[PDB]
Amino acid sequence: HTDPMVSKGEELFTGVVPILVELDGDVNGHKFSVSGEGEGDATYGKLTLKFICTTGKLPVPWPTLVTTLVLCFSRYPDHMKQHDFFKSAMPEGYVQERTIFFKDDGNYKTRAEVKFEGDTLVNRIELKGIDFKEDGNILGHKLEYNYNSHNVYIMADKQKNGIKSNFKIRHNIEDGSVQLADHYQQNTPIGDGPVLLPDNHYLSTQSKLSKDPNEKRDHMVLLEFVTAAGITLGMDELYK
């Protein structure tokens, strides 16, 4: 690429990159840990990850953890690569913080560091959840094991030299309803190096959730794709 800052970030994501995810969680005092392993191919926006609850039964539904459990693997098309904050922060990485408000239920607060340790991309997360209903849709495990595709607007946060985003997820309830999960996110670089501050744009995501037939632990197999879009005034003019 013409931009050596783009080149630097992209060089770290060429090919297939191994991923480690670590989550320590406490929801209403229900403590748990999650480990995940797999690989990402940013050229395709493609994640293949297998997560295990290493402490026993997961006390919340797996779909409620998808957003928490690596946006540096998003596909940014060439015309947008100068807008890829997530890769530009590497290898030192970024902090990803969220609050996720489940309507008429509790909230998750998450803090994670996403960085390289050698050739492995690590996502190390702490999650705290409070004010849940012990018999509600989350602690009562009333959600379908699936994840609806959706689109999310990414905005520069110039003052924190990072990005912010807020977006709604709707988890399907077994009874046919939906449980809203209202996400507030912010990302800021680790360390004092430079980053690419993006124009506002969108990420589109789809996720397939499955089970490993040979796995006896509580677990989730995730096939996730994330693709960036927008910044199209110039590109669209090429075809008029």
Q: Resolution of the experimental model in angstroms, please?
A: 1.5
- The answer to whether 119 and 18 are in contact (CB under 8 A) is yes
Alpha-carbon dihedral of residues 218, 184, 231, 69, nearest 10 degrees?
Answer: -20
> Domain range spanning residue 141?
4-237
Q: What are phi and psi of 13, to 5 degrees?
A: -115, 10
**Token reading at 137:** 């849709």
Whether residue 18 is preceded by a cis peptide bond, meaning omega within 30 degrees of 0, is: no
Please state, in angstroms and rounded to a whole number, the distance separating the CA atoms of residues 109 and 120: 25
CATH number, domain with residue 24: 2.40.155.10
95-231-152 Cα angle (round to 5)? 45
Strands 120-130 and 17-27 turn out to be parallel
Closest CA to 189 of 123, 82, 93: 93
**Deposited experimental method:** X-ray
Contacts of 5 (CB under 8 A, 6+ apart): 88, 194, 196
Structural domains of the chain, count: 1
Q: What residue type is assigned to position 172 of the chain? A: N
